[PDB]
Amino acid sequence: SCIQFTRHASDVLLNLNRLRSRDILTDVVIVVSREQFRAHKTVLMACSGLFYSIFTDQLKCNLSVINLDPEINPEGFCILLDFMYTSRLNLREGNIMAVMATAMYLQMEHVVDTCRKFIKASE
Amino acid sequence: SCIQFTRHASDVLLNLNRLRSRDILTDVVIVVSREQFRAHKTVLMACSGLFYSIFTDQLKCNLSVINLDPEINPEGFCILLDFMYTSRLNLREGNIMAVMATAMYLQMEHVVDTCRKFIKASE
Amino acid sequence: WVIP
Amino acid sequence: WVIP
Numbered sequence: 001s002c003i004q005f006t007r008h009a010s011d012v013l014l015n016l017n018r019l020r021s022r023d024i025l026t027d028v029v030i031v032v033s034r035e036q037f038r039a040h041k042t043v044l045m046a047c048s049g050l051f052y053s054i055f056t057d058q059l060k061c062n063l064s065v066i067n068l069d070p071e072i073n074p075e076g077f078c079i080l081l082d083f084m085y086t087s088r089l090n091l092r093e094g095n096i097m098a099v100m101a102t103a104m105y106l107q108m109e110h111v112v113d114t115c116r117k118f119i120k121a122s123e
Numbered sequence: 124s125c126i127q128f129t130r131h132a133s134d135v136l137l138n139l140n141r142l143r144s145r146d147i148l149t150d151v152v153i154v155v156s157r158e159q160f161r162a163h164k165t166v167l168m169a170c171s172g173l174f175y176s177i178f179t180d181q182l183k184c185n186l187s188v189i190n191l192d193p194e195i196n197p198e199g200f201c202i203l204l205d206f207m208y209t210s211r212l213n214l215r216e217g218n219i220m221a222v223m224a225t226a227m228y229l230q231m232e233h234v235v236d237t238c239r240k241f242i243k244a245s246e
Numbered sequence: 247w248v249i250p
Numbered sequence: 251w252v253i254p
């Protein structure tokens with residue numbers, strides 16, 4: 001018999017992004033080919049199968065720095081980190097291959113699906 | 124020119140609630156009249172003007188235990204903590220006064236608004 | 247607010 | 251996915 005506030009989840013995510021932009025309570029640095037990205041471990045886990053596996057590990061859950069595979073493109077990661085905190089994906093002809101490869105590595109199934117569909121339309 | 128995934132914010136919140144239910148990466152205990160509630164500081168800040176003020180304070184941001192005012196009802200807090208992680212509010216005739224008072228103290232404007240409206244309909 |  |  002609950003009532004539901006339609007905009008609550010969107011408002012929560014908007015506030016989490018405001019905390020990220022002001023670097024408030026960020027607890028991890030993600031290193032991608034020398035580029036560094038500060039974030040909240042919980043948000044990373046909520047969006048990515050890879051981060052979920054990493055931060056539920058009894059040893060890795062305590063790390064303040066995570067280094068990604070050197071094949072990962074920093075721009076592709078930045079676009080996906082922005083998507084995690086906003087639901088908006090900046091998908092372009094010039095970045096789609098790097099975004100899809102990064103989303104496959106991060107295990108972000110819905111992003112992988114839209115990249116596959118956008119690539120299939122161009123062939 | 125971004126594309127947007129409609130269900131992303133809801134899916135993020137659902138995963139944050141799954142982490143709460145398994146006590147994963149919870150970083151604070153909220154004490155309400157001897158009852159204890161584990162939560163994520165970022166989620167509390169994203170939902171409540173009071174927690175936002177508390178955890179942006181340079182001294183309080185580092186506390187692992189927060190004690191609420193003794194007038195706060197533990198059931199009212201539990202209902203609001205559930206709302207924070209699900210967007211669902213268990214509002215009933217028997218709890219509405221305690222829920223409204225707790226939401227006013229926590230500074231959760233949309234909850235206060237629906238409580239005022241439900242109370243006004245009953246008079 | 248809605249009935250979910 | 252939608253055009254926001």
Ligand SMILES: CSc1ncc(Cl)c(Nc2ccc3c(c2)CC(=O)N3)n1
Nearest residue numbers: 045046047049052107108109138141
């Ligand atoms: C599976 S239970 C669960 N519980 C809590 C969290 Cl934080 C979590 N995240 C997560 C796991 C897998 C995947 C994603 C997020 C996005 C995706 O495409 N795959 N999962």
Ligand SMILES: CSc1ncc(Cl)c(Nc2ccc3c(c2)CC(=O)N3)n1
Nearest residue numbers: 015018168169170172175230231232
């Ligand atoms: C105001 S900027 C901002 N930036 C980040 C966060 Cl985490 C935040 N939360 C917050 C502040 C005030 C209120 C709420 C959340 C819910 C409500 O009714 N009032 N606010």
Ligand SMILES: [Cl-]
Nearest residue numbers: 062063064065
């Ligand atoms: Cl470390």
Ligand SMILES: [Cl-]
Nearest residue numbers: 108109110111
């Ligand atoms: Cl995804």
Ligand SMILES: [Cl-]
Nearest residue numbers: 185186187188
């Ligand atoms: Cl403490």
Ligand SMILES: [Cl-]
Nearest residue numbers: 231232233234
């Ligand atoms: Cl609210």
